[PDB]
Design a protein around this ligand. Sequence first.
Ligand code: NAG
Ligand code: NAG
Ligand code: NAG
Ligand code: NAG
Ligand code: HG
Ligand code: HG
Length: 172
Amino acid sequence: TGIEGRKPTCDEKYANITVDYLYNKETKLFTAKLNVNENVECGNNTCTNNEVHNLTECKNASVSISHNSCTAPDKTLILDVPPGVEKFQLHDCTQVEKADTTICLKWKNIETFTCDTQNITYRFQCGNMIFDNKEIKLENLEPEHEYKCDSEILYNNHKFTNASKIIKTDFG
Ligand SMILES: *[C@@H]1O[C@H](CO)[C@@H](O)[C@H](O)[C@H]1NC(C)=O
Ligand SMILES: *[C@@H]1O[C@H](CO)[C@@H](O)[C@H](O)[C@H]1NC(C)=O
Ligand SMILES: *[C@@H]1O[C@H](CO)[C@@H](O)[C@H](O)[C@H]1NC(C)=O
Ligand SMILES: *[C@@H]1O[C@H](CO)[C@@H](O)[C@H](O)[C@H]1NC(C)=O
Ligand SMILES: [Hg+2]
Ligand SMILES: [Hg+2]
């Protein structure tokens, strides 16, 4: 209305910018989607449609972010890329003799990755119960019920993969 608003630094405007990781199974590479409304500019590497493409799993990549609405210095964003989605398998560990009263689900690490495992979190939702662990086991379940158990894997609190398992408390 009056005086033109002071432009912030791009490092100021995008200091807390978030990213979503989208795996391409064909290329075995990740795309980082920048969670911003405006069409941002990236130096040197391109970020067409606010996406940084062809990122190798478990490797840090840096992207300098700017826009006309903000001044220098650029926001230097470190992309801590997660492990490949095909390196994890959701396995049903339920013992067949106890299938009527138990659920056992476990994520299996089917191939090695260099990312630190301390930043890897596994979450499960069976019914409406939420678990945080690589493996979950429920016992004393009432027979003849059906549950949709949803699970996701986070890297630095970033969901990069997920899967579902429908389990019945019976023998077949
Ligand atoms: C990304 O990878 C794909 C598949 O390997 C390739 O066709 C493309 O040229 C790469 N480069 C960019 C910037 O998308
Ligand atoms: C990768 O990025 C994270 C976050 O910035 C950092 O803490 C870590 O030191 C980096 N890894 C290496 C090998 O420098
Ligand atoms: C490890 O991962 C957590 C997320 O679970 C992250 O917040 C933290 O910065 C990381 N710590 C180290 C020492 O790499
Ligand atoms: C997996 O993630 C997608 C979004 O990436 C979401 O639409 C879906 O509901 C998720 N849940 C499961 C368990 O597949
Ligand atoms: Hg399996
Ligand atoms: Hg493989």
